[PDB]
Amino acid sequence: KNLADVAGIALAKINNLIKQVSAATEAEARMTLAAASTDHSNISALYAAASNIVTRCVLNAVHALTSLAPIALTAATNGAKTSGHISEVIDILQQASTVAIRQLYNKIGDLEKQTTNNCGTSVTEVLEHILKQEALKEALLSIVKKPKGAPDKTAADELVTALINGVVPNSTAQTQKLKEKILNTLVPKLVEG
């Protein structure tokens, strides 16, 4: 049935957005602990820029969820139902036991429109999104810049490493390569002056 097809697509999206908020807030929790344990003026300014990015991932993902759930609920059951945790209804709809479907399909197409502007689904994934943002790069370079000589490259290494040990405590080959990739994309700006 066409409703059982869209119900499966709606539930897959709802489960994916729920995991987005879980990953992002888990990053925020380790960052706020990492910010409180250490007393440095510099690295704390990085956590400020990073926290502002991670919290806004959560606000965006919850905004998409609360908009999609009533939309999915109306389609699955045409009879008036606009409540949260519709997970049970579409799940059983997806298995067993048109206007609103059109309404739903568009919102799913609308949702993916913002698929590019979506932080990770895991803690490693959100971390990668954090370092890719200009806001974090702009904050990081301002801290390492010196008025006279060239910006300090060794400090930029140390600050990014401390941030990466705030979010992902256990280092991996991927975390190391991710740290190197982000620092490399900044090489043009750490040679100015």
């Epitope: 490259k153 060794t154 190391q176 190197e180 490399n184 090489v187």
Partner: antibody, heavy 121, light 112 residues
């Protein structure tokens, strides 16, 4: 200013081993990633690998043509870079260049003159 | 496992004119808008010299006659105006995915 020289090249028998070295001066060796690159006579440049600095764990990356046979190491006390070659084959004959990395496994901004290795019986 | 294809393999340009060398990647060597493509010059018997890093950044000490552009899979190196000292082979290199790879090289001949 920045100076890297290569040394240790020579004639090697097939299957034999050879260690080439790179003495550097004019910059803080410890702060930089270092690469090895080779060029067979009349052929294109070929990246062999790099070694990370002290801050990033002294670990290495290698191309597959050389993985398992060659080992890159460094001596931060003397600001010298090494490449240890084992189980050499005839097509490993090339000029071997030591090159300083501009970033963290990025582009190579300073190169040595190179040292020549010939593998032949 | 990124393959680098340079075109043309050989190029002859008159003094004062423009030389354009192109590198085509088998897959993207970019990371969002940031490029991991670099250009080197090698005169015969000499070590390579880095000209351009990250597609378009001119390395310090290199004259403004060199410039680079491109994104994703297609990049070009530009020499304007060409001089006698430009007689050399030029290589692209990508550091986007391990292992780093080089192009096959382009030999530039200066007409006289």
């Amino acid at each position: 200013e920045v100076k890297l020289e290569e040394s240790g090249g020579g004639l090697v028998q097939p299957g034999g081993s050879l260690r080439v070295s790179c003495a550097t001066s004019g910059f803080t060796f410890t702060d930089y990633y270092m690469n090895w690159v080779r060029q067979p006579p009349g052929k294109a440049l070929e990246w062999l690998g790099f070694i990370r600095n002290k801050a990033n764990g002294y670990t290495t990356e290698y191309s597959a043509s050389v993985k398992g046979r060659f080992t890159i190491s460094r001596d931060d006390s003397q600001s010298i870079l090494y490449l240890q070659m084992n189980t050499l084959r005839a097509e490993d004959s090339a000029s071997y260049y030591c090159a300083r990395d501009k970033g963290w496994g990025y582009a190579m901004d300073y190169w040595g003159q190179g040292t020549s290795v010939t593998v032949s019986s | 496992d990124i393959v680098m294809t340079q075109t043309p393999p050989s190029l002859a340009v008159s003094l004062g004119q423009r030389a354009t060398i192109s590198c085509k990647a088998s897959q993207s060597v970019d990371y969002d808008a940031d490029s991991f493509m670099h250009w080197y010059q090698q005169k015969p018997g000499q070590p390579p010299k880095l000209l351009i890093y990250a597609a378009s950044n001119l390395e310090s000490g290199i004259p403004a006659r060199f410039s680079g552009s491109g994104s994703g899979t297609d990049f070009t190196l530009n020499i304007r105006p060409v001089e006698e000292e430009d007689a050399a082979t030029y290589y692209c290199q990508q550091s986007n995915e391990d292992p780093w790879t080089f192009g096959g090289g382009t030999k530039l001949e200066i007409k006289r």
